[PDB]
Design an enzyme around this catalytic site. Structure first.
Site, PDB file in Angstrom:
ATOM      1  N   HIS C  43      -7.290  -3.681   9.937  1.00  0.00           N
ATOM      2  CA  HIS C  43      -5.898  -3.270   9.788  1.00  0.00           C
ATOM      3  C   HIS C  43      -5.631  -1.800  10.147  1.00  0.00           C
ATOM      4  CE1 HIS C  43      -6.899  -1.836   5.578  1.00  0.00           C
ATOM      5  NE2 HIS C  43      -6.028  -0.910   5.939  1.00  0.00           N
ATOM      6  N   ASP C  99     -10.958  -8.621   7.286  1.00  0.00           N
ATOM      7  CA  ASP C  99     -10.460  -7.299   7.648  1.00  0.00           C
ATOM      8  C   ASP C  99     -11.643  -6.407   8.046  1.00  0.00           C
ATOM      9  OD1 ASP C  99      -8.374  -4.854   5.877  1.00  0.00           O
ATOM     10  OD2 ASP C  99      -8.930  -5.095   8.000  1.00  0.00           O
ATOM     11  N   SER C 198      -8.149   3.350   3.378  1.00  0.00           N
ATOM     12  CA  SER C 198      -8.445   2.193   4.238  1.00  0.00           C
ATOM     13  C   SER C 198      -9.607   2.381   5.205  1.00  0.00           C
ATOM     14  CB  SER C 198      -7.218   1.822   5.084  1.00  0.00           C
ATOM     15  OG  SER C 198      -6.157   1.281   4.307  1.00  0.00           O
TER      16      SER C 198
HETATM   17  N1  LIG Z   1      -5.089  -0.026  -4.538  1.00  0.00           N
HETATM   18  C1  LIG Z   1      -5.768  -0.124  -3.413  1.00  0.00           C
HETATM   19  N2  LIG Z   1      -7.083  -0.232  -3.405  1.00  0.00           N
HETATM   20  C2  LIG Z   1      -5.079  -0.086  -2.156  1.00  0.00           C
HETATM   21  C3  LIG Z   1      -3.750  -0.124  -2.020  1.00  0.00           C
HETATM   22  S1  LIG Z   1      -3.245   0.059  -0.386  1.00  0.00           S
HETATM   23  C4  LIG Z   1      -4.913   0.130   0.131  1.00  0.00           C
HETATM   24  C5  LIG Z   1      -5.235   0.261   1.596  1.00  0.00           C
HETATM   25  N3  LIG Z   1      -4.838  -0.964   2.304  1.00  0.00           N
HETATM   26  C6  LIG Z   1      -3.546  -1.212   2.541  1.00  0.00           C
HETATM   27  O1  LIG Z   1      -2.663  -0.445   2.218  1.00  0.00           O
HETATM   28  C7  LIG Z   1      -3.207  -2.578   3.169  1.00  0.00           C
HETATM   29  C8  LIG Z   1      -2.770  -2.397   4.592  1.00  0.00           C
HETATM   30  C9  LIG Z   1      -1.672  -3.125   4.832  1.00  0.00           C
HETATM   31  C10 LIG Z   1      -1.190  -3.839   3.609  1.00  0.00           C
HETATM   32  N4  LIG Z   1      -2.079  -3.336   2.572  1.00  0.00           N
HETATM   33  C11 LIG Z   1      -1.890  -3.422   1.219  1.00  0.00           C
HETATM   34  O2  LIG Z   1      -2.743  -3.072   0.408  1.00  0.00           O
HETATM   35  C12 LIG Z   1      -0.558  -3.997   0.664  1.00  0.00           C
HETATM   36  C13 LIG Z   1      -0.870  -5.460   0.252  1.00  0.00           C
HETATM   37  C14 LIG Z   1      -1.308  -6.416   1.372  1.00  0.00           C
HETATM   38  C15 LIG Z   1      -1.899  -7.704   0.775  1.00  0.00           C
HETATM   39  C16 LIG Z   1      -2.368  -8.693   1.881  1.00  0.00           C
HETATM   40  C17 LIG Z   1      -1.243  -9.057   2.864  1.00  0.00           C
HETATM   41  C18 LIG Z   1      -0.561  -7.801   3.433  1.00  0.00           C
HETATM   42  C19 LIG Z   1      -0.141  -6.798   2.320  1.00  0.00           C
HETATM   43  N5  LIG Z   1      -0.133  -3.395  -0.632  1.00  0.00           N
HETATM   44  C20 LIG Z   1       0.384  -2.017  -0.750  1.00  0.00           C
HETATM   45  C21 LIG Z   1       0.704  -1.541  -2.162  1.00  0.00           C
HETATM   46  O3  LIG Z   1       0.506  -2.317  -3.095  1.00  0.00           O
HETATM   47  O4  LIG Z   1       1.113  -0.417  -2.350  1.00  0.00           O
HETATM   48  N6  LIG Z   1      -5.785   0.025  -0.893  1.00  0.00           N
END
Ligand SMILES: N=C(N)c1csc(CNC(=O)[C@@H]2CCCN2C(=O)[C@@H](CC2CCCCC2)NCC(=O)O)n1
Lengths: 28, 10, 250
Positions: C43, C99, C198
């Site tokens: 991603h 991913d 990420s």
């Molecule tokens: N609390 C964590 N570990 C955490 C939170 S955001 C992250 C890095 N990945 C991301 O940000 C990825 C990329 C795109 C969508 N991502 C998210 O983490 C989105 C949730 C996804 C779930 C699967 C389908 C697409 C959406 N949530 C953001 C939020 O809750 O603030 N790690």
């Protein structure tokens, strides 16, 4: 070959501030 | 962020 | 990283910074697995929902860093990408299943006190360490709280969580190619990865041979460090065959 062995720690037998936390959780 | 040497930007 | 602390020098010699050429900004975390290969989350490179679709010429790789914004002269090294490989069945449409992505450096990088590769798990290691209650380490330069940024590399130790608990914490369809980690509400302690983290590595140290192994990749979460919610990481070993498949023939 020598992956996972850090130059500033494992290779000189030094331990980092919290790696002890990890090993104490591996309770087999 | 602190600028990166142009030499890499190529 | 939320509720973590400043890493010490040379603590994560495999940590990598995914940096964007224009505009110059942090894009993602990553890891060095050999002198010519970098592992990260797919991603970070491709994600249609946000029009994110980078190419090899759009990014630069920065290795051996500690500070987030300074150009650490004589310490860090910058590499250009020669090619990118996204897993063919990466499901950006549903739940970010599989991913993962590999990056081929144009030229090998010389190792040093601050630049060393992490080990990839084998079946025995993975089987023995991937257990609930066992703690791992996540590192990153990402946000410190849910939305600012840290001055230096942040580190936090987190416990792996039982599949069931992970499943009952979200509406997102969980697959076998992912696992979740974090403290439970009552456990008192807390911590989590967050935006900007990420592609970062989730690692564990083997008590059998003392080597550090990367078990996961920071994939996703809902918010950052909220009670009853956990971070999800790509199950590296489960995609081990695709990893070797690529490297091997390229
Ligand atoms: N609390 C964590 N570990 C955490 C939170 S955001 C992250 C890095 N990945 C991301 O940000 C990825 C990329 C795109 C969508 N991502 C998210 O983490 C989105 C949730 C996804 C779930 C699967 C389908 C697409 C959406 N949530 C953001 C939020 O809750 O603030 N790690």
């Amino acid at each position: 070959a020598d992956c996972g062995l850090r130059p500033l720690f494992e290779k000189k037998s030094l331990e980092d501030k919290t790696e002890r936390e990890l090993l104490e959780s591996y309770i087999d | 962020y602190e600028p990166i040497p142009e030499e890499f930007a190529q | 990283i939320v509720e973590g602390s400043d890493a010490e020098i040379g603590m994560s010699p495999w940590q990598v910074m995914l940096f964007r050429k224009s505009p110059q900004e942090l894009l993602c975390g990553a890891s060095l697995i050999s002198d010519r290969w970098v592992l990260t989350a797919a991603h970070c490179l491709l994600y249609p929902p946000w029009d994110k679709n980078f190419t090899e010429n759009d990014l630069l790789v920065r290795i051996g860093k500690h500070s987030r914004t300074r150009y650490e002269r004589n310490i860090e090294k910058i590499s250009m990408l020669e090619k990118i490989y996204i897993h063919p069945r990466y499901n950006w449409r549903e739940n970010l299943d599989r991913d993962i992505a590999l990056m081929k450096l144009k030229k090998p990088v010389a190792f040093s006190d601050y630049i060393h590769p992490v080990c990839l798990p084998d079946r025995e290691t993975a089987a023995s360490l991937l257990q609930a209650g066992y703690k791992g380490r996540v590192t990153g330069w990402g946000n410190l709280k849910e939305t600012g940024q840290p001055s230096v590399l942040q580190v936090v130790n987190l416990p792996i969580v039982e599949r069931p608990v992970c499943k009952d914490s979200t509406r997102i369809r969980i697959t076998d190619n992912m696992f979740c980690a974090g403290y439970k509400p009552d456990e008192g302690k807390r911590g989590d990865a967050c935006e900007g983290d990420s592609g970062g590595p989730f690692v564990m140290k083997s008590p059998f041979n003392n080597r550090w192994y990367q078990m996961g990749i920071v994939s996703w979460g809902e918010g950052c460090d909220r009670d009853g919610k956990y971070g999800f990481y790509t199950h590296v070993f489960r995609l081990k065959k695709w990893i070797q498949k690529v490297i091997d023939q390229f």
